[PDB]
């Protein structure tokens, strides 16, 4: 009920450095350092052993975390994680450090993957929920994002309208680490424009469904940016200009290379899968 309102920004009426870019449009590679508390709903899916970052995710209540299904189940790469294999890290900023007194670590209680998730062909319905064993305590760095309703999705999911993607994924498509620019020290953020469905389809050979949308700049626009390895499962948000709340419209799903010209990032269409989300949450 208090979703999408950040403690360090909306709550005290302060704006972050680029949110105006999104509003102006209403009618991670090549991104930048996120401000503190800029994304209170940001979650890190963490592998117990070997301790590493699996994916991005988002907090939608004190007990539920949203993410991409391929983050937990992807037979092609022999990926099939179970509850105890993971941990969710919330309230983070630094990628590798254990942020004492600020971040909170949660154990998973149950994984819920969309029954019709298409890992075989095009990642259709790439969505998954995670119920935490215990509620997480909200704070200045920990707060849930809102989920879109039909009207909100209808007015904001338009070509040209920009959204925001965050994560600790790679800085470059080309394999790189802490030596020649590859892994970021802190959370990265990038604002990207939603793209016209026809354009999305013409950019790939893969079959695009209504449960997905694509975002990113066209080669002619000069500006760049995209998600990359380590960023999947992360949130694609938008700030409603109607009520000034942040809404998660998409989930980082897939692409073909990172930040490639003529190519775009694909995201899970959260609203189209909201009924499933509701059922799961209501049923369990």
């Amino acid at each position: 009920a208090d979703c999408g309102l950040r403690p360090l920004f909306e709550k005290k009426s302060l704006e972050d450095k680029t949110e105006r870019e999104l509003l102006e449009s209403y009618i991670i590679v090549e991104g930048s350092d996120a401000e503190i508390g800029m994304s209170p709903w940001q979650v890190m899916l963490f592998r117990k052993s070997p301790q590493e970052l699996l994916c991005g995710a988002s907090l939608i209540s004190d007990r539920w975390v949203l993410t991409a299904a391929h983050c937990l189940l992807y037979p092609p790469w022999d990926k099939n994680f179970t509850e105890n294999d993971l941990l969710v890290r919330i309230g983070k900023h630094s990628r590798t450090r254990y942020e004492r007194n600020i971040e909170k670590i949660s154990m998973l209680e149950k994984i819920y993957i969309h029954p019709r998730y298409n890992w075989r062909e095009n990642l259709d319905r790439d969505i998954a929920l995670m119920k935490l064993k215990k509620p997480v305590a909200f704070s200045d760095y920990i707060h849930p994002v809102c989920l879109p309703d039909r009207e909100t999705a209808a007015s904001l999911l338009q070509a040209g309208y920009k959204g925001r993607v965050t994560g600790w994924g790679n800085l470059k498509e080309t394999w790189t680490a802490n030596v020649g620019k590859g892994q970021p020290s802190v959370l990265q953020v990038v604002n990207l424009p939603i793209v016209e469905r026809p354009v999305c389809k013409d950019s790939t050979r893969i079959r695009i469904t209504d449960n997905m949308f694509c975002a990113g700049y066209k080669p002619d626009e000069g500006k760049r940016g995209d998600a990359c390895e380590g960023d999947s499962g992360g949130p694609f948000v938008m700030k409603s200009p109607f009520n000034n709340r942040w809404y998660q419209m998409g989930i980082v799903s897939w692409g073909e290379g990172c930040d490639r010209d003529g190519k775009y990032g694909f995201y899970t269409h959260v609203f189209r899968l909201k009924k499933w989300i509701q059922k799961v949450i209501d049923q369990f």
Partner: peptide, 10 residues
């Protein structure tokens, strides 16, 4: 690369 988290959560 990743700092050691407390065993309490492991």
């Amino acid at each position: 690369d990743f700092e050691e988290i407390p065993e309490e959560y492991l």
